[PDB]
Nucleic acid binder design. Sequence first.
RNA 1: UGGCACCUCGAUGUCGGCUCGUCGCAUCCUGGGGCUGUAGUCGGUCCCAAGGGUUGGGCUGUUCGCCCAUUAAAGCGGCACGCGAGCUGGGUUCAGAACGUCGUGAGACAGUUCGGUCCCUAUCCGUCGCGGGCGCAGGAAAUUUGAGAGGAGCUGUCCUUAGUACGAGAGGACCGGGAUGGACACACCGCUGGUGUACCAGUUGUUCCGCCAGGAGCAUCGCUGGGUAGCUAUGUGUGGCAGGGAUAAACGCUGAAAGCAUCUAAGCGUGAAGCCCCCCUCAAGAUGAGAUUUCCCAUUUCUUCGGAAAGUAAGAUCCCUGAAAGAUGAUCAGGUAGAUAGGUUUGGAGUGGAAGUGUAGCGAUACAUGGAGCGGACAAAUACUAAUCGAUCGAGGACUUAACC
Lengths: 206, 123, 53, 122, 113
Amino acid sequence: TKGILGRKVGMTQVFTENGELIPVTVIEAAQNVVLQKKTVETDGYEAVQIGFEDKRAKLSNKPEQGHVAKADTTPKRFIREFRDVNLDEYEIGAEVKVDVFAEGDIIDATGVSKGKGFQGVIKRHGQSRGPMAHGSRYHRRPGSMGPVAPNRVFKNKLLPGRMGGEQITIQNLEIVKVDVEKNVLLVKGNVPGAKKALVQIKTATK
Amino acid sequence: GYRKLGRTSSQRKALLRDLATDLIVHERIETTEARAKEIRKVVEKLITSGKKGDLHARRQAAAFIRHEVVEVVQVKNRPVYALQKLFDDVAPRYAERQGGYTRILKKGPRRGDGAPMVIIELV
Amino acid sequence: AVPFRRTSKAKKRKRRTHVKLQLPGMNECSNCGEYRLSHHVCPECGQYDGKDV
Amino acid sequence: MIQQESRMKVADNSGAREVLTIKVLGGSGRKTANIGDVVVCTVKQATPGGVVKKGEVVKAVIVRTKSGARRQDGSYIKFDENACVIIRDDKSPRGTRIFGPVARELRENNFMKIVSLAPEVL
Amino acid sequence: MNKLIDEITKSQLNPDVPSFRPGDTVRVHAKVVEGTRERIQLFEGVVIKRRGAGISETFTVRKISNGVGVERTFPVHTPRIAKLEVIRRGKVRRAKLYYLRNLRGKAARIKEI
RNA sequence: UGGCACCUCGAUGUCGGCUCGUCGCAUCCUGGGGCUGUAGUCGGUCCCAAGGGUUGGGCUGUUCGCCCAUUAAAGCGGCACGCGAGCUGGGUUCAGAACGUCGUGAGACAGUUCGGUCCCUAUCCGUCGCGGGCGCAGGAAAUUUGAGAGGAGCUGUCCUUAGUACGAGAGGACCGGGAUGGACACACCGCUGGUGUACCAGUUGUUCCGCCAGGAGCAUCGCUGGGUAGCUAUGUGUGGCAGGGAUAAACGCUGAAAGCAUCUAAGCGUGAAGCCCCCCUCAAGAUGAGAUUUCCCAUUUCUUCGGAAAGUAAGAUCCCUGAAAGAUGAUCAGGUAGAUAGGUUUGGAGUGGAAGUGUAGCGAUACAUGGAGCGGACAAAUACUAAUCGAUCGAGGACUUAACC
Ligand SMILES: [Mg+2]
Ligand SMILES: [Mg+2]
Ligand SMILES: [Mg+2]
Ligand SMILES: [Mg+2]
Ligand SMILES: [Mg+2]
Ligand SMILES: [Mg+2]
Ligand SMILES: [Mg+2]
Ligand SMILES: [Mg+2]
Ligand SMILES: [Mg+2]
Ligand SMILES: [Mg+2]
Ligand SMILES: [Mg+2]
Ligand SMILES: [Mg+2]
Ligand SMILES: [Mg+2]
Ligand SMILES: [Mg+2]
Ligand SMILES: [Mg+2]
Ligand SMILES: [Mg+2]
Ligand SMILES: [Mg+2]
Ligand SMILES: [Mg+2]
Ligand SMILES: [Mg+2]
Ligand SMILES: [Mg+2]
Ligand SMILES: [Mg+2]
Ligand SMILES: [Mg+2]
Ligand SMILES: [Mg+2]
Ligand SMILES: [Mg+2]
Ligand SMILES: [Mg+2]
Ligand SMILES: [Mg+2]
Ligand SMILES: [Mg+2]
Ligand SMILES: [Mg+2]
Ligand SMILES: [Mg+2]
Ligand SMILES: [Mg+2]
Ligand SMILES: [Mg+2]
Ligand SMILES: [Mg+2]
Ligand SMILES: [Mg+2]
Ligand SMILES: [Mg+2]
Ligand SMILES: [Zn+2]
């Protein structure tokens, strides 16, 4: 059970040894370092705090410079935690390379979905339209809201709103190729998010 | 994704051609904010075409410039048109300058409808 | 699609608590010596960035 | 992609000449069949003297489609009309000859006799 | 277009493919991999289209066999093409030759440069 | 199906469909078990179980029903016969006309047939999303625990075990292992396709740029053939996998009351798609306001103590350039400590061989210069143009007790 943070670059395809063609997504994971180590007797749980991508001296304030200077290295841009991981590894300040994964492993990809604005109900919840002819005047509307008796409308009545932008994870996703010197990682499939999105790679729970 | 300016495709192209030609002739015009931000790019591409100085480039530019007289010179009265000014006066001015032939300066809201007016000039 | 009961004064004012309008973002031109809008050409001395236009 | 109410030519030597599909077998709410799928169908146009008569309810396999299939290696194959072959209770055709090319996906579904009888298996 | 994708995928490009443009006859020595057999079958026809960039470029070949027209699409750089030959060099005025889908014989014939 | 006539006649819209569902269990399928006229396969009946599933058409305004073809199955009911300020009006139930019948007649029939106006800008609660204020005994920047709450629990076929157990034969397994699907859900645009009104080309009519050549306006984007970025499904990847604790029906162990027996009285063991977990998401306004790391410190004057204001620190905002975000706020990337946007120079997709000139042909036209020219949104360098200058907000930490600082 090991994990890294990454930056989604794009998506392409590669040919396997058998000749079959598969789609892959390219994730680059350079510059990520170990910052803090949470223990049960100090915080109540065990975790490892990983800082991913460094940024300029400007854009970073004094408190976070102090936090990173509690270890080595410059201020970072993304910081996340990993639970259910061994703590005997991960010396403070040591970097994490993509070589912690081998070809044929199974990972879980976590990220933030692409954003859709104020979206209707045929698109957000996948409902069905009314007839578009035969004298109908009811095309893309939510529907009825229930019986007369309650004098109200129940909860979880699906209605239009802001669609995208939530956190999503997908499981049992295979890893194809690892290239250490380019700090890249090829994963068969697709992961949530737009380009340049933060992607969290971790060993599959199941 | 450029910018629709409250008007259809054929109307929008006609508006852009009018403002681009008005900026070549007078060199200093006052318009709204989005409208100036849009004509900036077309005027700069047109000036690049003038920088090239070819006959093919001249035809490319002539497919955009409105045909109107800038001023008349006594060579014998012979008017000079906007394309002639673009290829003889405006383009040689920025021969040594690569990009950014225009600047935008903000003014303040219009009285009638509160539109944010700016002044755009080619220097 | 029609009001069941008329609105009291308290509820009307409570709704109107947010219908104010904000203060302009202005400061003083170094050359003029009086107020002007930031990132705008001051109309008194007719200058921007210390240069007349 | 063929669902109920679709018409498609027959590509064998039985009496049928045109076939309208009735049902798609293999699921409760299934609504589309492709190359190598069996469908219940009715005979609309038939040739005189054939073994299979007009207005008969038979089940038959799909041989070629307008939108074909993709292989594991990344290649695709598409035909120019929809065709069909009328089969028995087992996977043996009722006719004796087959016209036109046949997709290779019939091998994996154990339609061996049809593939053998086909002039060209692509 | 990304440069990192190009650097990763540059290894698997095929340098042995010839130069062809849509509108000329080619012959494909495609390999047919059974469960425990290896055979090469020949597909010959005119190329209808060629689209994409990089490793993800594909081309389409059209053939009329037994009256029924058959179109088969290949990736350009696939390892399953033993050899690709250019037989003829037709003359066309289009990049996509979709109009041939509605033409029978003696009217779909293509001139030669 | 009825009885009564208690609210509504200063109006409680009445049948079927469509969209959206949600509850009950008297369970249609799937899960567990007892009995069997339970040899095996296939079944019947009852008990525990509501977690998810529970088709597409022909006829009829039809609910219903009959029929065709599938399926593991095509459950029965409640919610103003759920749902018309959500939809349609085929039917009922206005004015026209006609048939059969009744009436002397005007007319009538819950007998039939053809045609017949469906109004409303959401105030309060409710539901779905998004902000501002204050609180949380100093002011801030990040990372988090999880009380609680939503989401998902579906199922087929083939091979092997094995022609084995069983059985006179006919026929033909439970359990176990493997492969691959149906419907549904989430994400994404590398592939197959759709769109793509500031991309490329062909072409008709007419007007214009003084004329030729080359172009422009209008004609649905004039029409036609392609198509970049984005958005997409019918396309692709993945999911409901294995499991733990306590139980229901049921099956048992040990065991007295009742020297025997007994699943019960004390005490233990097995045991379900169900309960609580595992899995995914929200979550400290959880006023019970939690935790960890790091930063700034203890200033100056008025007060009757209490307390007040007034310059600031760490930090944030006004204002400006924007998109990976977006109705508007908000969120994110930047503001010369600069690649945030436009431009410029190189590229890429896409289209398909530009203008000028030359040659061949009487001419339409063809060939060469030349994978040419053009090229919105895509990539990399470059400070050339605009993010100039400033301003505003923002802490000095109450009391009591205990270990001890
Ligand atoms: Mg976080
Ligand atoms: Mg309409
Ligand atoms: Mg109530
Ligand atoms: Mg037009
Ligand atoms: Mg191409
Ligand atoms: Mg009475
Ligand atoms: Mg009333
Ligand atoms: Mg019961
Ligand atoms: Mg039983
Ligand atoms: Mg249930
Ligand atoms: Mg009919
Ligand atoms: Mg009702
Ligand atoms: Mg009733
Ligand atoms: Mg009732
Ligand atoms: Mg209602
Ligand atoms: Mg309304
Ligand atoms: Mg009479
Ligand atoms: Mg009428
Ligand atoms: Mg708030
Ligand atoms: Mg909880
Ligand atoms: Mg047998
Ligand atoms: Mg696509
Ligand atoms: Mg002419
Ligand atoms: Mg005109
Ligand atoms: Mg078009
Ligand atoms: Mg037409
Ligand atoms: Mg399970
Ligand atoms: Mg147990
Ligand atoms: Mg707190
Ligand atoms: Mg960009
Ligand atoms: Mg900022
Ligand atoms: Mg730039
Ligand atoms: Mg040419
Ligand atoms: Mg000549
Ligand atoms: Zn001034």
